[PDB]
UniProtKB/TrEMBL annotation:
It comes from Bacteroides thetaiotaomicron (strain ATCC 29148 / DSM 2079 / JCM 5827 / CCUG 10774 / NCTC 10582 / VPI-5482 / E50). Zn(2+) binds at D112, D145, H261. GO terms for molecular function: aminopeptidase activity; glutaminyl-peptide cyclotransferase activity; zinc ion binding. The keyword Transport does not apply. Transmembrane segments: none annotated. Keywords: Acyltransferase, Aminopeptidase, Hydrolase, Metal-binding, Protease, Signal, Transferase, Zinc. The keyword Glycoprotein does not apply. CDD domains: M28_like. SUPFAM superfamilies: Zn-dependent exopeptidases. This is Leucine aminopeptidase. Residues 69-285 form the Peptidase M28 domain. Pfam families: Peptidase_M28 (PF04389). InterPro entries: Peptidase_M28, QC/QCL.
Length: 290
């Protein structure tokens, strides 16, 4: 039996906190620039071959976003690969806040942004120390969360979201890129979260959902990964499935956590035990692929 490393939730939690400590990671801000440098630096320290994808992405309102997708690759020559995704930007508006006064205020995005990234940094650390059989790509996607605000009077186009993933899906970081499958982590740090099988994931990658939920159960996380269909959610994996044609699932809580797109999406609501359940399940999956 392959040795599956132990996900260190304390370290993952640190990596979440480190991102949040920059402040909001809103595209076109200095805090976003600084955190991108931190993330690329950490991947490089953890033995990844780092590729940066800088792109001028146009937001719903015409704003040019100076975006940066960050890719860290392990065993880059291997043609048998697994892609692991998380968005790293944070939403510029707390547009679901209970107080209307807060609807134009940027969120810290501890869960929505930092959590997936922090879990994947811990996975990168472990992959470097003991390489799985398959090549692993860690892909931090920018400009996911700049989609039309709720307070905007006008069209709310689906494609206003997930700008970095649309770009990456149309413009792979290496010519002829392919992966066997992908896993997207979105909001994987919240206290008490549970995860159901997401709808587009079921549509495009049902065998990958089966693989992940079976691994979760075997790893002791069957109360966190509930074997039931949940909601259909627009997220980066929709665009990866449609445009890149890589079978990709989303690990995302079931509605959204109460902190979503509020000013309360901060470290107070992050529980390292949620990070552990999700992270350990991902390790179980990627190390057992042949
Ligand atoms: Zn969000």
């Amino acid at each position: 039996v392959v040795n599956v490393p132990q996900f260190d939730a304390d370290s993952a939690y640190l990596y979440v906190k480190n991102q949040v400590d920059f402040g909001p990671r809103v595209p076109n801000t200095k805090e976003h620039v600084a955190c991108g440098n931190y993330l690329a630096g950490k991947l490089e320290a953890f033995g990844a071959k780092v590729t940066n994808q800088y792109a001028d992405l146009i937001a719903y309102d015409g704003t040019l976003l100076k975006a940066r997708n960050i890719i860290g690759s392990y065993k880059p020559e291997s043609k048998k690969r697994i892609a692991l995704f998380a968005h790293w930007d944070t939403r510029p508006w707390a547009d679901n806040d209970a107080d209307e006064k807060n609807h134009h205020t940027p969120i810290l995005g501890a869960n929505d942004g930092a959590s997936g990234v922090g879990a994947l940094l811990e996975i990168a650390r472990l992959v470097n120390q003991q390489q799985p059989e398959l090549g692993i790509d860690i892909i931090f996607l920018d400009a996911e969360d700049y989609g039309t605000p709720q307070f905007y009077e006008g069209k709310h186009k689906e494609e206003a979201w997930c700008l970095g993933s649309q770009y990456w899906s149309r413009n792979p970081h290496v010519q002829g890129y392919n992966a066997r499958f992908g896993i997207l982590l979105d909001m994987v740090g919240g206290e008490n979260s549970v995860f159901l099988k997401e709808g587009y994931s079921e549509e495009f990658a049902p065998d990958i959902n089966k693989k992940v939920w079976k691994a979760a159960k075997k790893a002791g996380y069957g109360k966190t990964f509930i074997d039931e269909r949940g909601d259909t959610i627009t997220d980066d994996h929709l665009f990866i499935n449609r445009l890149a044609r890589i079978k990709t699932i989303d690990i995302i809580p079931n509605g959204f956590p109460p902190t979503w797109h509020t000013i309360h999406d901060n470290m107070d609501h992050i529980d390292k035990n949620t990070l552990k359940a999700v992270g350990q399940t991902v390790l179980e999956v990627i190390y057992n692929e042949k």
